[PDB]
Amino acid sequence: MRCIGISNRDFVEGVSGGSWVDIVLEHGSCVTTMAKNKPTLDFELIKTEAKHPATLRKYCIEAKLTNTTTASRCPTQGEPSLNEEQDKRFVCKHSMVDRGWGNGCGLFGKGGIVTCAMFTCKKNMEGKIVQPENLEYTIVITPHSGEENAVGNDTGKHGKEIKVTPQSSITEAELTGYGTVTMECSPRTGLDFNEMVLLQMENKAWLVHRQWFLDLPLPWLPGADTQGSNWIQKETLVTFKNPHAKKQDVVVLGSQEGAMHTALTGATEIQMSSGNLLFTGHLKCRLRMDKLQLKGMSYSMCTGKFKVVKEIAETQHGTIVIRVQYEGDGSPCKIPFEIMDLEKRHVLGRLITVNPIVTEKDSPVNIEAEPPFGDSYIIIGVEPGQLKLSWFKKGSSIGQMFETTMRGAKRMAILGDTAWDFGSLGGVFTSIGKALHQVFGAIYGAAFSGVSWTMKILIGVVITWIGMNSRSTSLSVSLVLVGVVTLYLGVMVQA
Amino acid sequence: KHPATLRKYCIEAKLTNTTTASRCPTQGEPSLNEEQDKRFVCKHSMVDRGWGNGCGLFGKGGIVTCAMFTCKKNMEGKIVQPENLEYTIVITPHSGEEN
Amino acid sequence: DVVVLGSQEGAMHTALTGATEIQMSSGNLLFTGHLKCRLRMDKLQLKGM
Amino acid sequence: LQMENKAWLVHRQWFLDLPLPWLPGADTQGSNWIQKETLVTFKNPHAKKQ
Amino acid sequence: SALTQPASVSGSPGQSITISCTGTSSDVGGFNYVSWFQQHPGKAPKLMLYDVTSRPSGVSSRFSGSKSGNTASLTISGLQAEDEADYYCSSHTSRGTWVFGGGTKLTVL
Amino acid sequence: SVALVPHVGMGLETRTETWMSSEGAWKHAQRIETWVLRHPGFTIMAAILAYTIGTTYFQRVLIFILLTAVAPSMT
Amino acid sequence: SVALVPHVGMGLETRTETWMSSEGAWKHAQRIETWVLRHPGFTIMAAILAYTIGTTYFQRVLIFILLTAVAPSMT
Amino acid sequence: SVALVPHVGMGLETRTETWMSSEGAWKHAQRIETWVLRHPGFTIMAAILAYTIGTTYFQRVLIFILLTAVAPSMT
Numbered sequence A: 001m002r003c004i005g006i007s008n009r010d011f012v013e014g015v016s017g018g019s020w021v022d023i024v025l026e027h028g029s030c031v032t033t034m035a036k037n038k039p040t041l042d043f044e045l046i047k048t049e050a051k052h053p054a055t056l057r058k059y060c061i062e063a064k065l066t067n068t069t070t071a072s073r074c075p076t077q078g079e080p081s082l083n084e085e086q087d088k089r090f091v092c093k094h095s096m097v098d099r100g101w102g103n104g105c106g107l108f109g110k111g112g113i114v115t116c117a118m119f120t121c122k123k124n125m126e127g128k129i130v131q132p133e134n135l136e137y138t139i140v141i142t143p144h145s146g147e148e149n150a151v152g153n154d155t156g157k158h159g160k161e162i163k164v165t166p167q168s169s170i171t172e173a174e175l176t177g178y179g180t181v182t183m184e185c186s187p188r189t190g191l192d193f194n195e196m197v198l199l200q201m202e203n204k205a206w207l208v209h210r211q212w213f214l215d216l217p218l219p220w221l222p223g224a225d226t227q228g229s230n231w232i233q234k235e236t237l238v239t240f241k242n243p244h245a246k247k248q249d250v251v252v253l254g255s256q257e258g259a260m261h262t263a264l265t266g267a268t269e270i271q272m273s274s275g276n277l278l279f280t281g282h283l284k285c286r287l288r289m290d291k292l293q294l295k296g297m298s299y300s301m302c303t304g305k306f307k308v309v310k311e312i313a314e315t316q317h318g319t320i321v322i323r324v325q326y327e328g329d330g331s332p333c334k335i336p337f338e339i340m341d342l343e344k345r346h347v348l349g350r351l352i353t354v355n356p357i358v359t360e361k362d363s364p365v366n367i368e369a370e371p372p373f374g375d376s377y378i379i380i381g382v383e384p385g386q387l388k389l390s391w392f393k394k395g396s397s398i399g400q401m402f403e404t405t406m407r408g409a410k411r412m413a414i415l416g417d418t419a420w421d422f423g424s425l426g427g428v429f430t431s432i433g434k435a436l437h438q439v440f441g442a443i444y445g446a447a448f449s450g451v452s453w454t455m456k457i458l459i460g461v462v463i464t465w466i467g468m469n470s471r472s473t474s475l476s477v478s479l480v481l482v483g484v485v486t487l488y489l490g491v492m493v494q495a
Numbered sequence B: 001k002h003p004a005t006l007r008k009y010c011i012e013a014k015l016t017n018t019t020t021a022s023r024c025p026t027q028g029e030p031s032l033n034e035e036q037d038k039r040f041v042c043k044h045s046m047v048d049r050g051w052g053n054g055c056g057l058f059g060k061g062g063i064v065t066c067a068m069f070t071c072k073k074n075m076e077g078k079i080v081q082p083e084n085l086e087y088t089i090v091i092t093p094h095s096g097e098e099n
Numbered sequence C: 001d002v003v004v005l006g007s008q009e010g011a012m013h014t015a016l017t018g019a020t021e022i023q024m025s026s027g028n029l030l031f032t033g034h035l036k037c038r039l040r041m042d043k044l045q046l047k048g049m
Numbered sequence D: 001l002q003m004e005n006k007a008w009l010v011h012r013q014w015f016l017d018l019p020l021p022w023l024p025g026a027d028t029q030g031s032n033w034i035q036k037e038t039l040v041t042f043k044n045p046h047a048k049k050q
Numbered sequence E: 001s002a003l004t005q006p007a008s009v010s011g012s013p014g015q016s017i018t019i020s021c022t023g024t025s026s027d028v029g030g031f032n033y034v035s036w037f038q039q040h041p042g043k044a045p046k047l048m049l050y051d052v053t054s055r056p057s058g059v060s061s062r063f064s065g066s067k068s069g070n071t072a073s074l075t076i077s078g079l080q081a082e083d084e085a086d087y088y089c090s091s092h093t094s095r096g097t098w099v100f101g102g103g104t105k106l107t108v109l
Numbered sequence F, G, H: 001s002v003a004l005v006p007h008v009g010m011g012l013e014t015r016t017e018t019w020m021s022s023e024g025a026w027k028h029a030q031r032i033e034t035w036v037l038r039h040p041g042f043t044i045m046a047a048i049l050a051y052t053i054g055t056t057y058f059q060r061v062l063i064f065i066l067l068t069a070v071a072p073s074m075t
């Protein structure tokens, strides 16, 4: 029931020979795994933690100047010198001013002038980095037991969370009553934390590209620097003003916090106050359902009366969830649940909370099932007092096919070349598709890095037009496909 | 002389008294008393709702977030009528004086 | 959630590129621009003539 | 839709397209009307007063 | 904004007695955040029902909850002497706060 | 400034909403529209120059769009 | 951001030096150079697109220049 | 006005009479007829324009009818 009520649900159906399935886990998403003899499980990536961050650069977003000094030299005497030019905590500039008898000079020319001021940082943004071995993905595996944890906390069940680290990427959950599940994850491929910086700025943290971070035009410290006083690009945070040729001056350029916020658009925000927590990204895992068994398959039908205690509702995914209570004898019984037609001649829908059972009489169990599009009837119980529930599913099968194609394409857009692993059961077609996607995505990312979505749409339109106005059919079709894919990615790029 | 203020821009603000209101799917928009006040910046959006968070339906429930906007620094922009435009000129003859 | 989106002093300083600075601290003084004048030499007489 | 002791069964989208000032379904104050300008007119006949 | 409940309620032992919690469209008419708390004298409140009808693990099955429009109801079927207590209704409102009923005193006699 | 390099085409993007993604999506186009409205004179010259340079109508439109998009931003 | 709408072409310039004339004279060209260095792939594809669209070297070179100048800008 | 967007053509009709079906069935026809009577000048211009945009009596009659129906409606 944890995975219900989340609009980004994914249904992964089927395990291969070996009883394993490849599932990508995303933070905002959730995965419901359906296997034939296995119970239905819900997998959610609820946390990614980076530990032991190391700073590589401390940028200055707000500074001040305190000790301004000037040296002036008469024309043809060369540029002047201040003793504080050697000082790395001072920012200096060389200019020229008009000189002559009026200035106490005696030569009437452009006399070089140098002005220096002490650069002091008042606000900085850290750029901590983390080693890929220090990530820790937390995952919650919850099965469709149809039951609840129960408020009585003296016993706490149904809450198995597994931590996955690059060192320990294989772990098993012990779901009570359902055996155990094995997750064979690959954290080292989910995110390249050697090309990412945990940018923290005034109680707000972002995850950013490392080259982008190193390219920022603000003054920076090495990161091990413990006293400031050696800022590198101090000239980017100051301005030297020589109106006409009378005097030279230097002033600071105000807090760069808002300009940084503008620069950070397109960077995913993370948390860095109580640990470095990243609620973004994906995990590729292999699900080992071999030692996963349905609970209570030795039980018998209830042969009793059920009452609906939570009225049937339709989730955002085309399934229906209902909560029924059993009022009969033989408490540990399988619940007779069918999605038939009006005459009950055909089975039209397949339930999702597979093998719904009653463990205690006074313990409601909520069933999730997938009805067909249109009229359908939910039948619960057996002939005496059997409760028959009607339902109408408003969609269309063609509409569902379109929605699933759209969802698959969107997954490809986000997890490019990793979308081939979301539900893959091995196979040769999946491998060929993934290899082709890797080869094509290498070129696409090379040719489209650092381009805004508007530029992507423009380039897609241009390429589509070029392909349309192409004599060669072999070139025209390829160009049109490239243009349409570019247009799609540009229309669904910013996230 | 005597410039007149034409507009004050805010360059540094702060948000306080943040509040939110939610409504179940298909039941319309949530209401916040602070929406009436213009010192509060507000936005309407949709969140996932369902049995888990107390709704009988499983759609996109509307939500409204309101926070009080307070300005901390200004960028006042003033204007001057050309009449109050004292220019100053210095005329020095080539008298040849020593200084 | 709602966040206040930083301080725009530096962003404005960058935006004011191409604008000449003036002194409004006390008096709204300007040290830029021109002034076209017509000079009358009628009453000018050489000193020391 | 019920209006002054008479009720109608209307289309939902049509009802939400109505050009009148409205309040949300759950609004306790009753005073934050949304598109008030549909029920007031502003007069500036000669550009003298409004 | 307090949820309205009858001041008092009495039912003969072994009978069934119902309690009402009338609220607004935001507290108990809009959301399923309806909870019933039983408080014996000199003791902290005890969660009797939640999500309208769901009852805690230790809570007897004699306690049943219903909700209709802006009103949520609590029913007791056994009416044992131990059931005589003060019952409070609470709801999580649309503005993110918690409102409590005025509480009904149930007496068996 | 830093605001002129706004961490857009860096990959690293996911399902989770990025920072300032609601506004930055269209604020550039809004800025270009405001510039074109506030400076009609240049747009006419850009159209004339694109017509002169562009042999076909595809080249002319492409050149005009590029010119009018780069005129304010190049500032 | 305000930083994307500077006060450059307002036509009020005098002989007096402006706010960041020295700094901001070449900042945009530096940004274009850095972006082109960090993202060569878009440069090659922009050159290919300009060569294809442009029938004459003038059109091709102009299109390539405009594409390269506008790509970092929206970025 | 709300009166300018009636609850007509919404697909919710049943056997039971709607709110003002009998009265409002021919209101539009009555209004167009009254407008045509009061404003014979525009009708002649509409006929002339329909004939000018002709090549077929079906086209001319349809265009004239549409213009006459839209003249009061546009108000």
Ligand SMILES: *[C@@H]1O[C@H](CO)[C@@H](O)[C@H](O)[C@H]1NC(C)=O
Pocket (backbone or CB within 6 Å): A066, A067
């Ligand atoms: C800078 O000026 C301060 C006065 O505010 C003075 O105390 C300090 O010694 C100076 N430091 C230098 C000149 O390095």
Ligand SMILES: *[C@@H]1O[C@H](CO)[C@@H](O)[C@H](O)[C@H]1NC(C)=O
Pocket (backbone or CB within 6 Å): A101, A102, A103, A104, B099
């Ligand atoms: C300028 O004039 C002042 C007063 O007339 C005199 O003291 C000074 O020596 C002159 N020369 C300068 C300031 O170079």
Ligand SMILES: *[C@@H]1O[C@H](CO)[C@@H](O)[C@H](O)[C@H]1NC(C)=O
Pocket (backbone or CB within 6 Å): B016, B017
């Ligand atoms: C906002 O909260 C402060 C407490 O931090 C309080 O003093 C003030 O009255 C509140 N304002 C409003 C409008 O609720």
